């Protein structure tokens, strides 16, 4: 079903990094995320600059580098009351949304971090991992590594829901016990890589493909989203998506609904319990879409493309990012 | 704190420690670093009947400055004379009476001299040297300033008469002046000198004489005739009724003319007439006293502003690096520094604004919860931070340098 | 300047920028950063007949702080009422009367409210909250301090009655107190509220009532009964005749009792009684005012040292140079900045020394002829220069930036 | 007659520019001159550095560059009450002896200045010239060019005594009226160049040779000093000086006596009115002597060599450069 234009329009847009930004030459955004307070959208650069933007029109708010620029891309955001957590390949940094530093951790075992999540301790503790055979547990309140654990699998994503869902760089998903971090179940989602992962207390959803890029073969995304039932611990039927599924987010208010996006900026909104009813709409990205997120209320949708643009789409009728 | 008073208070300090090395003056038992305070090199003393010299000198015991009044060539015939009067006058402390401390005899000057020691009130000019300085002027002294003088002398006389004493010396030249604050600076001098002079009068008859000298001192200033004479008083009195109030003319008339034999005279009855004016004087003093209170804050705060200026200047040009939290803080300070001192408009002209420099530093001094915009050169970095936060970041940075 | 006097001035500046971020309070048309001044969460208005709220607030235009008096739930019946009275009272400036500026109505608070705006007098406690605190006791208020209060109010009443106005609100809780300086802080409030009330009185008989309320306020403090009543006055009056002077007893009696039908009453005639005390009050003020003048000298040095710190921070870090003299000048300053704040020991640890920072700036303040060693990094350039020269280069550099 | 060592000895020495000086690579001193106050000796470098040294032991005082180093050598010092005046090829600079800048003049007609002198106006005015066809008159008090004059003769030296004595780069001397700057007399001193010039109110003395250096012919100094009578305006008999005369100074106390120096550091003190009586002495330069001066009292003699050394000679018994 097509989307009524009264429900779907471009509300704001920003270039970050722009041509006058010191990191412009290194490429487009590395990640984006809606804050869970203060109406903020966060964008990272390929050299570790973080920019935040307020509301649907994306008026610039704050910006600061969260690690040395030789460390490369800003890999992921997480949000707590006290501030924003920033992960880079070589270190982990925490600062207030003002930009005021809170603590800084640069541990020897942090060689190529890619992902982080919360654990069994609410927002008091995080787990961090990446393309390396070590994991680190960090007390977010104290700002120190408190535990080191071995891991055989290397990870591209981490997110805590009912369990810690951990996407490997081989296309499988490990479901981890949030207290002990031991593996409960392994799921074969895609052949060689996972391009995106989201999760609710009842579901995991992933995007990926059968082979990583070589000079012989481009990485091709699979024509479906793979779905796993977290409630009953078994794989489910995939959600068909012929335009090739690049990104996916669970809808925060419609608890059984998923939001699926392709690289040309075409978006389908599809209920997991019944795929028959999905809304189709189109956006007009200048370039190829690289990243996607949804706000806590579900009302704001953000997309960054490879031409350095970030767009916010949604209803023209007074949307709010948080309560 | 304005411009003129800032120099006024500065000159007061330069005057205190001012010295003359070629002075050729002695150092007494209890004093040193004497300094000639006399403007008029040739000396005849208005009321003493001897010659008088004025010296600034430092005490030996406590090192603070005092004003010395030297009576050249006096014979200490009675030791009873001095101590009889220094005891009484030392007890009188008034805002319009230069406090007298002791009185001794010294021979170091090369002759016998009697020495009175007083409070030192730097930048005091005499009342004479002020309203008629040597070197035209037809400006009349505004009636309000005349009334201030009546009150301040009345205040001084009220104190002196209650100790059962008399001013004895009450003259235009023997009253210092400082920013319109007049004080009797020659008190207790004539008590010793006329201690055993012929035809001694009653302290009760002296007190009555204090009123006549008083009336004359004002009347002089009214008609602008620094030297007045009892020979033409009544003619002078008619000349003030158009330039001044009918009220003032009565006060002078009362003060100068002798009272009816039954009545006598007291300061109290003088104060009874001028009730309204005393209140206005009181009001002004207070308001001035409050005005001073403000300045004593902003200039005490400047001292605090400066200690912060220091800590900032230390961290912002020292570069040496450990962890990334440090790198965040060290940047914020430089950006804070630019926000205040390096303010530039479009096209980069220096926006000098000393009010702006102050505002921010006070906000830093009190840890104001106000938040400001910090921007980098390339506009890449942007902070939104309160003064309270920045101050804490500064105190921490400066603190770690010392370890 | 002693310890506590340094604190009084410290707290006074702290009190000004004191903020509450958690305030459930608004921003009005012309104001912002409101601040609750009220001690008692429970509210009764001593004289208004409504509930009252007190706020400190910053103006938006000029950024200075003011004291706001909020009358909760008022309707503003007449526009004639406000401007007929704010104009007249705005004219009255007294050392014992909290100056009222304008009066406007705002509804932002969540109700219709009338707002009076006053001078902000930091560290103010009420006359009530001071001599009768909510903690308690025993102890008598010294008579002299009672006399100080009589005079200050008489001075305050004198201004108001001469302007053909009346105090209207004159009560222990509606008089602020600061270091024994009491002021009427509720002026012009009752003029608006009773502007078109039913039982309006003569302004001349309101003036007569002002003497009686006055009599209550002193006698209250005399008999130590914060709440007193005309129900037992004659009995109350007798209890002070041994505890205080016979003179004081008559004065209260005069103020309180209704006058003989022929006489009427005036502030002038009160002053006739208290003549001697007026002179003594003025005398205290002056002496205290002189005390501040001393302190205002020692601390004035702080004003310039900070003023120099500004110019230094401004010229540096500011860009190619036109002629060659500039490259010479711009170099000496940057090297001088290193000699003071960036002193390093052997092995380069930061030698922190707050004495040194002061010493150099004092030497710069007086343009001392002492010479210091300035050296470049490569040791190629070497200067031997006095502070006096550097000061001149700084004054020019800062001077040229604004042109 | 040889000099008794109790009247003549080496009192001090300094290297300037030394090996750790930024101008070392550019060569030896460009000029030296005794100050007329404060016991200072001044030394210039090939890139315009000025160094000052105190007393007979040559204790270091101040040092600073007086024009952009691309301007080349420091050409000359002059001394006045207020400070020191410095001439370079492209500019004229004045600073206090402290190093505090006083003024800076970089006028377009200053293309290759080589020499400057005072005029008829005490220390209030200087005349400046060089290897160029303009001269400039400078008010020393105001620090501005006040006059520009064209010139056909190009100058290597200028000095004021009774008149302004002006040595051309061809070996001739122009005697200029100090008021009008017009030429009063031309004197043929040497064949092609003048290596040095000094003058008192009564005499001119010069050193030089017949040809400037080519790959065919080294510049050879003449075996004599040429002498001109300024009082009676006529040439005098030359003073014979077989070691080849490189430098000459009038003795400030013995008014008819000259001090003559050769490149091996040999010095003769000779009365002009009768050359028969001259005192002979020797110095010990490491290299070839390039510059020489005498203090106002005559008691101090300074010599700079091509090994970057400057030496001070005089009596060991308390000599003073000035009052
Ligand atoms: N107690 C004091 N403390 C400080 N300075 C004073 C004091 N008394 C007077 N002076 C100053 O010193 C001078 C007073 O000396 P004085 O000798 O009374 O003046 P004078 O004109 O010489 N009178 P005379 O010598 O009788 O003609 C005045 O210029 C005052 O400003
Ligand atoms: N103009 C002013 N400037 C600064 N502070 C003031 C001013 N007026 C009052 N204050 C102080 O702020 C507090 C609130 O004023 P006020 O309303 O008089 O106190 P209160 O005891 O609540 N009176 P009431 O509510 O009638 O019982 C008092 O304790 C005063 O010390
Ligand atoms: Mg005298
Ligand atoms: Mg209240």
PDB file of N, CA and C in Angstrom, chain B residues 288-360:
ATOM      1  N   UNK B 288      27.159  58.076  50.435  1.00  0.00           N
ATOM      2  CA  UNK B 288      28.570  57.996  50.095  1.00  0.00           C
ATOM      3  C   UNK B 288      29.166  56.715  50.657  1.00  0.00           C
ATOM      4  N   UNK B 289      28.733  56.347  51.861  1.00  0.00           N
ATOM      5  CA  UNK B 289      29.284  55.177  52.529  1.00  0.00           C
ATOM      6  C   UNK B 289      28.896  53.901  51.805  1.00  0.00           C
ATOM      7  N   UNK B 290      27.728  53.925  51.168  1.00  0.00           N
ATOM      8  CA  UNK B 290      27.237  52.793  50.385  1.00  0.00           C
ATOM      9  C   UNK B 290      27.955  52.721  49.046  1.00  0.00           C
ATOM     10  N   UNK B 291      28.134  53.886  48.436  1.00  0.00           N
ATOM     11  CA  UNK B 291      28.877  54.014  47.193  1.00  0.00           C
ATOM     12  C   UNK B 291      30.266  53.399  47.335  1.00  0.00           C
ATOM     13  N   UNK B 292      30.898  53.638  48.482  1.00  0.00           N
ATOM     14  CA  UNK B 292      32.207  53.063  48.777  1.00  0.00           C
ATOM     15  C   UNK B 292      32.095  51.553  48.909  1.00  0.00           C
ATOM     16  N   UNK B 293      30.993  51.109  49.502  1.00  0.00           N
ATOM     17  CA  UNK B 293      30.749  49.689  49.720  1.00  0.00           C
ATOM     18  C   UNK B 293      30.704  48.893  48.422  1.00  0.00           C
ATOM     19  N   UNK B 294      30.105  49.474  47.387  1.00  0.00           N
ATOM     20  CA  UNK B 294      30.034  48.827  46.082  1.00  0.00           C
ATOM     21  C   UNK B 294      31.464  48.642  45.576  1.00  0.00           C
ATOM     22  N   UNK B 295      32.225  49.735  45.560  1.00  0.00           N
ATOM     23  CA  UNK B 295      33.582  49.711  45.033  1.00  0.00           C
ATOM     24  C   UNK B 295      34.462  48.724  45.784  1.00  0.00           C
ATOM     25  N   UNK B 296      34.246  48.596  47.090  1.00  0.00           N
ATOM     26  CA  UNK B 296      35.048  47.676  47.893  1.00  0.00           C
ATOM     27  C   UNK B 296      34.718  46.224  47.530  1.00  0.00           C
ATOM     28  N   UNK B 297      33.613  46.024  46.820  1.00  0.00           N
ATOM     29  CA  UNK B 297      33.299  44.703  46.296  1.00  0.00           C
ATOM     30  C   UNK B 297      33.954  44.434  44.946  1.00  0.00           C
ATOM     31  N   UNK B 298      33.654  45.285  43.964  1.00  0.00           N
ATOM     32  CA  UNK B 298      34.134  45.083  42.598  1.00  0.00           C
ATOM     33  C   UNK B 298      35.656  45.081  42.547  1.00  0.00           C
ATOM     34  N   UNK B 299      36.298  45.766  43.493  1.00  0.00           N
ATOM     35  CA  UNK B 299      37.754  45.864  43.478  1.00  0.00           C
ATOM     36  C   UNK B 299      38.359  44.749  44.323  1.00  0.00           C
ATOM     37  N   UNK B 300      37.536  44.108  45.148  1.00  0.00           N
ATOM     38  CA  UNK B 300      37.998  42.949  45.896  1.00  0.00           C
ATOM     39  C   UNK B 300      37.814  41.731  45.003  1.00  0.00           C
ATOM     40  N   UNK B 301      36.759  41.793  44.197  1.00  0.00           N
ATOM     41  CA  UNK B 301      36.455  40.779  43.197  1.00  0.00           C
ATOM     42  C   UNK B 301      37.512  40.756  42.095  1.00  0.00           C
ATOM     43  N   UNK B 302      38.020  41.935  41.738  1.00  0.00           N
ATOM     44  CA  UNK B 302      39.098  42.045  40.758  1.00  0.00           C
ATOM     45  C   UNK B 302      40.314  41.245  41.192  1.00  0.00           C
ATOM     46  N   UNK B 303      40.550  41.215  42.499  1.00  0.00           N
ATOM     47  CA  UNK B 303      41.652  40.458  43.062  1.00  0.00           C
ATOM     48  C   UNK B 303      41.443  38.982  42.812  1.00  0.00           C
ATOM     49  N   UNK B 304      40.183  38.566  42.870  1.00  0.00           N
ATOM     50  CA  UNK B 304      39.805  37.175  42.678  1.00  0.00           C
ATOM     51  C   UNK B 304      39.804  36.841  41.195  1.00  0.00           C
ATOM     52  N   UNK B 305      39.254  37.760  40.404  1.00  0.00           N
ATOM     53  CA  UNK B 305      39.294  37.686  38.950  1.00  0.00           C
ATOM     54  C   UNK B 305      40.719  37.454  38.457  1.00  0.00           C
ATOM     55  N   UNK B 306      41.676  38.114  39.106  1.00  0.00           N
ATOM     56  CA  UNK B 306      43.079  38.025  38.714  1.00  0.00           C
ATOM     57  C   UNK B 306      43.710  36.662  39.015  1.00  0.00           C
ATOM     58  N   UNK B 307      43.378  36.065  40.157  1.00  0.00           N
ATOM     59  CA  UNK B 307      43.925  34.751  40.501  1.00  0.00           C
ATOM     60  C   UNK B 307      43.446  33.672  39.530  1.00  0.00           C
ATOM     61  N   UNK B 308      42.274  33.887  38.943  1.00  0.00           N
ATOM     62  CA  UNK B 308      41.731  32.978  37.937  1.00  0.00           C
ATOM     63  C   UNK B 308      42.412  33.224  36.595  1.00  0.00           C
ATOM     64  N   UNK B 309      42.603  34.501  36.270  1.00  0.00           N
ATOM     65  CA  UNK B 309      43.376  34.917  35.104  1.00  0.00           C
ATOM     66  C   UNK B 309      44.724  34.207  35.041  1.00  0.00           C
ATOM     67  N   UNK B 310      45.324  34.007  36.213  1.00  0.00           N
ATOM     68  CA  UNK B 310      46.619  33.343  36.340  1.00  0.00           C
ATOM     69  C   UNK B 310      46.548  31.878  35.926  1.00  0.00           C
ATOM     70  N   UNK B 311      45.681  31.125  36.602  1.00  0.00           N
ATOM     71  CA  UNK B 311      45.540  29.692  36.366  1.00  0.00           C
ATOM     72  C   UNK B 311      45.249  29.392  34.902  1.00  0.00           C
ATOM     73  N   UNK B 312      44.439  30.241  34.279  1.00  0.00           N
ATOM     74  CA  UNK B 312      44.108  30.095  32.866  1.00  0.00           C
ATOM     75  C   UNK B 312      45.335  30.277  31.977  1.00  0.00           C
ATOM     76  N   UNK B 313      46.084  31.347  32.224  1.00  0.00           N
ATOM     77  CA  UNK B 313      47.267  31.665  31.431  1.00  0.00           C
ATOM     78  C   UNK B 313      48.341  30.581  31.525  1.00  0.00           C
ATOM     79  N   UNK B 314      48.323  29.812  32.608  1.00  0.00           N
ATOM     80  CA  UNK B 314      49.334  28.784  32.819  1.00  0.00           C
ATOM     81  C   UNK B 314      49.076  27.555  31.949  1.00  0.00           C
ATOM     82  N   UNK B 315      47.834  27.085  31.947  1.00  0.00           N
ATOM     83  CA  UNK B 315      47.472  25.873  31.218  1.00  0.00           C
ATOM     84  C   UNK B 315      47.412  26.038  29.694  1.00  0.00           C
ATOM     85  N   UNK B 316      46.950  27.195  29.225  1.00  0.00           N
ATOM     86  CA  UNK B 316      46.675  27.379  27.799  1.00  0.00           C
ATOM     87  C   UNK B 316      47.861  27.596  26.858  1.00  0.00           C
ATOM     88  N   UNK B 317      49.088  27.460  27.349  1.00  0.00           N
ATOM     89  CA  UNK B 317      50.240  27.565  26.456  1.00  0.00           C
ATOM     90  C   UNK B 317      51.247  26.468  26.790  1.00  0.00           C
ATOM     91  N   UNK B 318      50.818  25.533  27.631  1.00  0.00           N
ATOM     92  CA  UNK B 318      51.621  24.369  27.975  1.00  0.00           C
ATOM     93  C   UNK B 318      51.045  23.113  27.321  1.00  0.00           C
ATOM     94  N   UNK B 319      51.819  22.500  26.429  1.00  0.00           N
ATOM     95  CA  UNK B 319      51.395  21.288  25.747  1.00  0.00           C
ATOM     96  C   UNK B 319      52.316  20.098  25.965  1.00  0.00           C
ATOM     97  N   UNK B 320      51.772  19.034  26.551  1.00  0.00           N
ATOM     98  CA  UNK B 320      52.539  17.825  26.845  1.00  0.00           C
ATOM     99  C   UNK B 320      51.638  16.606  27.024  1.00  0.00           C
ATOM    100  N   UNK B 321      51.564  15.760  25.999  1.00  0.00           N
ATOM    101  CA  UNK B 321      50.815  14.506  26.098  1.00  0.00           C
ATOM    102  C   UNK B 321      51.249  13.504  25.031  1.00  0.00           C
ATOM    103  N   UNK B 322      48.290  12.509  28.204  1.00  0.00           N
ATOM    104  CA  UNK B 322      48.316  11.054  28.301  1.00  0.00           C
ATOM    105  C   UNK B 322      47.068  10.423  27.684  1.00  0.00           C
ATOM    106  N   UNK B 323      45.938  10.539  28.376  1.00  0.00           N
ATOM    107  CA  UNK B 323      44.688   9.954  27.901  1.00  0.00           C
ATOM    108  C   UNK B 323      43.783  11.000  27.249  1.00  0.00           C
ATOM    109  N   UNK B 324      42.686  10.546  26.653  1.00  0.00           N
ATOM    110  CA  UNK B 324      41.893  11.408  25.784  1.00  0.00           C
ATOM    111  C   UNK B 324      41.019  12.426  26.513  1.00  0.00           C
ATOM    112  N   UNK B 325      40.622  12.120  27.745  1.00  0.00           N
ATOM    113  CA  UNK B 325      39.853  13.068  28.548  1.00  0.00           C
ATOM    114  C   UNK B 325      40.596  14.394  28.687  1.00  0.00           C
ATOM    115  N   UNK B 326      41.913  14.302  28.864  1.00  0.00           N
ATOM    116  CA  UNK B 326      42.783  15.468  28.950  1.00  0.00           C
ATOM    117  C   UNK B 326      42.714  16.313  27.683  1.00  0.00           C
ATOM    118  N   UNK B 327      42.703  15.637  26.536  1.00  0.00           N
ATOM    119  CA  UNK B 327      42.717  16.299  25.235  1.00  0.00           C
ATOM    120  C   UNK B 327      41.416  17.057  24.977  1.00  0.00           C
ATOM    121  N   UNK B 328      40.331  16.576  25.570  1.00  0.00           N
ATOM    122  CA  UNK B 328      39.047  17.246  25.468  1.00  0.00           C
ATOM    123  C   UNK B 328      39.028  18.528  26.277  1.00  0.00           C
ATOM    124  N   UNK B 329      39.463  18.427  27.528  1.00  0.00           N
ATOM    125  CA  UNK B 329      39.523  19.568  28.437  1.00  0.00           C
ATOM    126  C   UNK B 329      40.457  20.671  27.931  1.00  0.00           C
ATOM    127  N   UNK B 330      41.694  20.296  27.611  1.00  0.00           N
ATOM    128  CA  UNK B 330      42.695  21.236  27.111  1.00  0.00           C
ATOM    129  C   UNK B 330      42.236  22.044  25.896  1.00  0.00           C
ATOM    130  N   UNK B 331      41.303  21.491  25.127  1.00  0.00           N
ATOM    131  CA  UNK B 331      40.773  22.179  23.954  1.00  0.00           C
ATOM    132  C   UNK B 331      39.720  23.197  24.356  1.00  0.00           C
ATOM    133  N   UNK B 332      38.848  22.783  25.267  1.00  0.00           N
ATOM    134  CA  UNK B 332      37.731  23.600  25.720  1.00  0.00           C
ATOM    135  C   UNK B 332      38.220  24.923  26.308  1.00  0.00           C
ATOM    136  N   UNK B 333      39.322  24.865  27.048  1.00  0.00           N
ATOM    137  CA  UNK B 333      39.898  26.052  27.669  1.00  0.00           C
ATOM    138  C   UNK B 333      40.354  27.069  26.629  1.00  0.00           C
ATOM    139  N   UNK B 334      41.078  26.603  25.614  1.00  0.00           N
ATOM    140  CA  UNK B 334      41.547  27.480  24.545  1.00  0.00           C
ATOM    141  C   UNK B 334      40.374  28.135  23.821  1.00  0.00           C
ATOM    142  N   UNK B 335      39.286  27.384  23.674  1.00  0.00           N
ATOM    143  CA  UNK B 335      38.085  27.892  23.021  1.00  0.00           C
ATOM    144  C   UNK B 335      37.348  28.869  23.931  1.00  0.00           C
ATOM    145  N   UNK B 336      37.431  28.638  25.236  1.00  0.00           N
ATOM    146  CA  UNK B 336      36.838  29.548  26.210  1.00  0.00           C
ATOM    147  C   UNK B 336      37.606  30.862  26.216  1.00  0.00           C
ATOM    148  N   UNK B 337      38.929  30.747  26.158  1.00  0.00           N
ATOM    149  CA  UNK B 337      39.827  31.894  26.116  1.00  0.00           C
ATOM    150  C   UNK B 337      39.558  32.794  24.915  1.00  0.00           C
ATOM    151  N   UNK B 338      39.238  32.174  23.784  1.00  0.00           N
ATOM    152  CA  UNK B 338      38.969  32.906  22.552  1.00  0.00           C
ATOM    153  C   UNK B 338      37.617  33.600  22.606  1.00  0.00           C
ATOM    154  N   UNK B 339      36.672  32.973  23.299  1.00  0.00           N
ATOM    155  CA  UNK B 339      35.322  33.504  23.419  1.00  0.00           C
ATOM    156  C   UNK B 339      35.310  34.845  24.143  1.00  0.00           C
ATOM    157  N   UNK B 340      36.254  35.027  25.061  1.00  0.00           N
ATOM    158  CA  UNK B 340      36.310  36.231  25.878  1.00  0.00           C
ATOM    159  C   UNK B 340      37.255  37.289  25.318  1.00  0.00           C
ATOM    160  N   UNK B 341      38.528  36.925  25.214  1.00  0.00           N
ATOM    161  CA  UNK B 341      39.591  37.881  24.929  1.00  0.00           C
ATOM    162  C   UNK B 341      39.840  38.111  23.443  1.00  0.00           C
ATOM    163  N   UNK B 342      39.445  37.152  22.614  1.00  0.00           N
ATOM    164  CA  UNK B 342      39.730  37.222  21.185  1.00  0.00           C
ATOM    165  C   UNK B 342      38.465  37.476  20.380  1.00  0.00           C
ATOM    166  N   UNK B 343      37.462  38.074  21.018  1.00  0.00           N
ATOM    167  CA  UNK B 343      36.246  38.474  20.317  1.00  0.00           C
ATOM    168  C   UNK B 343      36.550  39.343  19.104  1.00  0.00           C
ATOM    169  N   UNK B 344      36.088  38.893  17.945  1.00  0.00           N
ATOM    170  CA  UNK B 344      36.236  39.646  16.710  1.00  0.00           C
ATOM    171  C   UNK B 344      34.921  39.676  15.948  1.00  0.00           C
ATOM    172  N   UNK B 345      34.626  40.805  15.314  1.00  0.00           N
ATOM    173  CA  UNK B 345      33.435  40.913  14.484  1.00  0.00           C
ATOM    174  C   UNK B 345      33.674  40.206  13.154  1.00  0.00           C
ATOM    175  N   UNK B 346      32.709  40.303  12.250  1.00  0.00           N
ATOM    176  CA  UNK B 346      32.949  39.922  10.867  1.00  0.00           C
ATOM    177  C   UNK B 346      34.065  40.815  10.339  1.00  0.00           C
ATOM    178  N   UNK B 347      35.022  40.206   9.637  1.00  0.00           N
ATOM    179  CA  UNK B 347      36.215  40.856   9.070  1.00  0.00           C
ATOM    180  C   UNK B 347      37.338  40.975  10.100  1.00  0.00           C
ATOM    181  N   UNK B 348      37.138  40.380  11.271  1.00  0.00           N
ATOM    182  CA  UNK B 348      38.222  40.167  12.216  1.00  0.00           C
ATOM    183  C   UNK B 348      38.789  41.362  12.962  1.00  0.00           C
ATOM    184  N   UNK B 349      38.080  42.488  12.962  1.00  0.00           N
ATOM    185  CA  UNK B 349      38.507  43.625  13.769  1.00  0.00           C
ATOM    186  C   UNK B 349      38.323  43.285  15.246  1.00  0.00           C
ATOM    187  N   UNK B 350      39.281  43.694  16.073  1.00  0.00           N
ATOM    188  CA  UNK B 350      39.260  43.355  17.491  1.00  0.00           C
ATOM    189  C   UNK B 350      38.105  44.018  18.237  1.00  0.00           C
ATOM    190  N   UNK B 351      37.153  43.212  18.705  1.00  0.00           N
ATOM    191  CA  UNK B 351      36.095  43.735  19.560  1.00  0.00           C
ATOM    192  C   UNK B 351      36.607  43.867  20.984  1.00  0.00           C
ATOM    193  N   UNK B 352      37.182  45.023  21.289  1.00  0.00           N
ATOM    194  CA  UNK B 352      37.629  45.283  22.642  1.00  0.00           C
ATOM    195  C   UNK B 352      36.401  45.634  23.467  1.00  0.00           C
ATOM    196  N   UNK B 353      36.245  44.967  24.604  1.00  0.00           N
ATOM    197  CA  UNK B 353      35.069  45.149  25.442  1.00  0.00           C
ATOM    198  C   UNK B 353      35.413  44.732  26.862  1.00  0.00           C
ATOM    199  N   UNK B 354      35.856  45.697  27.661  1.00  0.00           N
ATOM    200  CA  UNK B 354      36.334  45.401  29.004  1.00  0.00           C
ATOM    201  C   UNK B 354      35.184  45.024  29.930  1.00  0.00           C
ATOM    202  N   UNK B 355      33.978  45.459  29.586  1.00  0.00           N
ATOM    203  CA  UNK B 355      32.786  44.989  30.278  1.00  0.00           C
ATOM    204  C   UNK B 355      32.578  43.505  29.996  1.00  0.00           C
ATOM    205  N   UNK B 356      32.821  43.106  28.750  1.00  0.00           N
ATOM    206  CA  UNK B 356      32.688  41.710  28.345  1.00  0.00           C
ATOM    207  C   UNK B 356      33.711  40.814  29.036  1.00  0.00           C
ATOM    208  N   UNK B 357      34.954  41.283  29.117  1.00  0.00           N
ATOM    209  CA  UNK B 357      36.013  40.531  29.788  1.00  0.00           C
ATOM    210  C   UNK B 357      35.647  40.289  31.249  1.00  0.00           C
ATOM    211  N   UNK B 358      35.059  41.305  31.873  1.00  0.00           N
ATOM    212  CA  UNK B 358      34.637  41.234  33.271  1.00  0.00           C
ATOM    213  C   UNK B 358      33.468  40.282  33.480  1.00  0.00           C
ATOM    214  N   UNK B 359      32.400  40.484  32.707  1.00  0.00           N
ATOM    215  CA  UNK B 359      31.180  39.685  32.814  1.00  0.00           C
ATOM    216  C   UNK B 359      31.458  38.187  32.881  1.00  0.00           C
ATOM    217  N   UNK B 360      32.270  37.711  31.943  1.00  0.00           N
ATOM    218  CA  UNK B 360      32.604  36.297  31.835  1.00  0.00           C
ATOM    219  C   UNK B 360      33.402  35.795  33.034  1.00  0.00           C
TER     220      UNK B 360
END
